[PDB]
Amino acid sequence: VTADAALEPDERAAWLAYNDTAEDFPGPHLLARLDAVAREHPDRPAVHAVDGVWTYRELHRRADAVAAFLAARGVRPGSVVAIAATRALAPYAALLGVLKAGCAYVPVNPDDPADRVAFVLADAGATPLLLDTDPASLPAAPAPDVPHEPDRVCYVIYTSGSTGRPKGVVMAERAVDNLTHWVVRRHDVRPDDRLGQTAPLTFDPSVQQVFPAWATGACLVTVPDDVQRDPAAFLDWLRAERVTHLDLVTSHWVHLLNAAEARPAELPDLRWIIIGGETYYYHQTHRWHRVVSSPARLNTIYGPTEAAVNATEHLTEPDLDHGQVPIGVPLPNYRLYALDDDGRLCPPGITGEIHIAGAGLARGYRSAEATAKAFHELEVHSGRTERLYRTGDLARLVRHADRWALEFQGRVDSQVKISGYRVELEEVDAAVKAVPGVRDAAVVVRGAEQLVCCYVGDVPPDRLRSRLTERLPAYLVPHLLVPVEAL
Numbered sequence: 001v002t003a004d005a006a007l008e009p010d011e012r013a014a015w016l017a018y019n020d021t022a023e024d025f026p027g028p029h030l031l032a033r034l035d036a037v038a039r040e041h042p043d044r045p046a047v048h049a050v051d052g053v054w055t056y057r058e059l060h061r062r063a064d065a066v067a068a069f070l071a072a073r074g075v076r077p078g079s080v081v082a083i084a085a086t087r088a089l090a091p092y093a094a095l096l097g098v099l100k101a102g103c104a105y106v107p108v109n110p111d112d113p114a115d116r117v118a119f120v121l122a123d124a125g126a127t128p129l130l131l132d133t134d135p136a137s138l139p140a141a142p143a144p145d146v147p148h149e150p151d152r153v154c155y156v157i158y159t160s161g162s163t164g165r166p167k168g169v170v171m172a173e174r175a176v177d178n179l180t181h182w183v184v185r186r187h188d189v190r191p192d193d194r195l196g197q198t199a200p201l202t203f204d205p206s207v208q209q210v211f212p213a214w215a216t217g218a219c220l221v222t223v224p225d226d227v228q229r230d231p232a233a234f235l236d237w238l239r240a241e242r243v244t245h246l247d248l249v250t251s252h253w254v255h256l257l258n259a260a261e262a263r264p265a266e267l268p269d270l271r272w273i274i275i276g277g278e279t280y281y282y283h284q285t286h287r288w289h290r291v292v293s294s295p296a297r298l299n300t301i302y303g304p305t306e307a308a309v310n311a312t313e314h315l316t317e318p319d320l321d322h323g324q325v326p327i328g329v330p331l332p333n334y335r336l337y338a339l340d341d342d343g344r345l346c347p348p349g350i351t352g353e354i355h356i357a358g359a360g361l362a363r364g365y366r367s368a369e370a371t372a373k374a375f376h377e378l379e380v381h382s383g384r385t386e387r388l389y390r391t392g393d394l395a396r397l398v399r400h401a402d403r404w405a406l407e408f409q410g411r412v413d414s415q416v417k418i419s420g421y422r423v424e425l426e427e428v429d430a431a432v433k434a435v436p437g438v439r440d441a442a443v444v445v446r447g448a449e450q451l452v453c454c455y456v457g458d459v460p461p462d463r464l465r466s467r468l469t470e471r472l473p474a475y476l477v478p479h480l481l482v483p484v485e486a487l
């Protein structure tokens with residue numbers, strides 16, 4: 001009956017040890033800890049963005065004005081509110097103000113195609129009030145009296161899902177609080193620290209940097225767009241800004257490694273890089289530690305948006321120089337299982353599909369159908385019935401050093417990543433062919449870091465590029481638009 005029924009006692013025992021991850025965290029709930037920091041450290045720098053730096057006192061005052069504005073416009077607790085994801089100060093007042101109002105934020109890239117923004121607002125049930133007026137200039141006010149309700153939704157974040165089928169992941173407070181406690185404790189986040197935010201607010205590694213900063217008194221430092229596409233400049237910016245903690249996707253880190261090998265870097269203030277997204281190898285991380293002079297350690301993480309940013313972690317050993325880096329052990333209060341096509345727990349060493357349980361799970365998606373397809377219930381061990389999120393990722397349980405660890409093995413479908421962004425190449429196919437004048441087109445992955453398109457048409461590449469930005473997010477516009485006589 002159970003999922004582990006066919007396993008031998010040793011195989012069962014390995015999974016039981018792997019998922020022995022309960023941990024109790026103290027203090028009040030997440031927003032109360034944010035307010036406590038603001039009360040105790042009003043003068044500390046809370047956010048450093050392209051147009052200046054706000055103290056905790058000022059960030060919370062601006063957020064209070066957002067919350068009062070929302071209430072005055074009939075936005076009651078439990079609503080969803082879009083925020084414009086930029087690299088300036090305003091989005092931070094917006095997102096904090098939304099939470100202070102008892103609401104959840106949905107981050108929107110104001111440069112994204114209008115059609116896609118429209119879907120997000122509709123699917124998220126979100127008001128655009130804060131997209132249409134500067135949140136940072138709203139009339140000053142005290143924060144409205146919002147009662148505490150447990151496990152309020154905090155954000156809805158969209159992932160590409162399938163073509164024509166964006167998925168809005170609904171994340172509630174207990175998951176975000178658990179994640180925040182983990183970031184702070186695992187990486188020793190302290191009030192003097194400076195947490196860089198590489199990901200835009202539309203991608204969930206930003207959550208991992210923003211809330212641990214504000215829950216400790218540290219400074220959130222947004223990484224400017226003009227340094228991200230220049231890896232050499234990014235390395236010098238990390239030095240100049242004295243950054244202590246940094247989020248990176250694997251493919252972006254590979255560009256940094258290449259820049260570091262071209263000009264080795266000293267980063268004495270950097271202590272943690274929380275890195276993940278794609279498989280990488282000890283021959284790469286060994287190269288990194290040779291050319292980056294820094295105490296910085298690489299914490300490899302894995303996990304879908306549907307399970308609160310990360311689900312597993314592995315501290316990368318700098319001395320190892322070959323083999324695949326494992327994705328590691330579950331975060332506190334997470335449990336993960338490798339299941340075969342029938343739903344039985346795989347023995348150690350056998351590749352199965354990852355199913356995730358525990359404190360990090362999303363409420364679900366905004367859409368009921370997507371929720372019913374991915375979230376289910378299963379008795380994995382005798383007496384343990386789990387709510388599970390089905391990931392579509394493949395992995396196997398292995399011995400690494402003297403403990404069990406998951407090792408990533410790929411996916412069950414054709415989803416791939418380009419410069420660290422999920423892509424269905426068919427979606428890019430359909431966009432280019434939809435441009436009037438384009439007769440046919442084929443989009444190919446070049447690297448990891450390059451999307452190359454060959455197209456038959458009477459339209460010059462510069463003009464096709466202009467048409468595609470109106471239709472695709474910028475990161476899905478192919479890097480090379482090559483006109484060909486025939487494919």
Ligand SMILES: Nc1ncnc2c1ncn2[C@@H]1O[C@H](COP(=O)(O)O)[C@@H](O)[C@H]1O
Nearest residue numbers: 276277278279301302303304305393408
């Ligand atoms: N450390 C990793 N190694 C390999 N694949 C990963 C890793 N982290 C995330 N992924 C993949 O990227 C998907 C989305 O996760 P994320 O990029 O963290 O939002 C996952 O479902 C996996 O397919």
Ligand SMILES: [Mg+2]
Nearest residue numbers: 303304309310
């Ligand atoms: Mg993740």
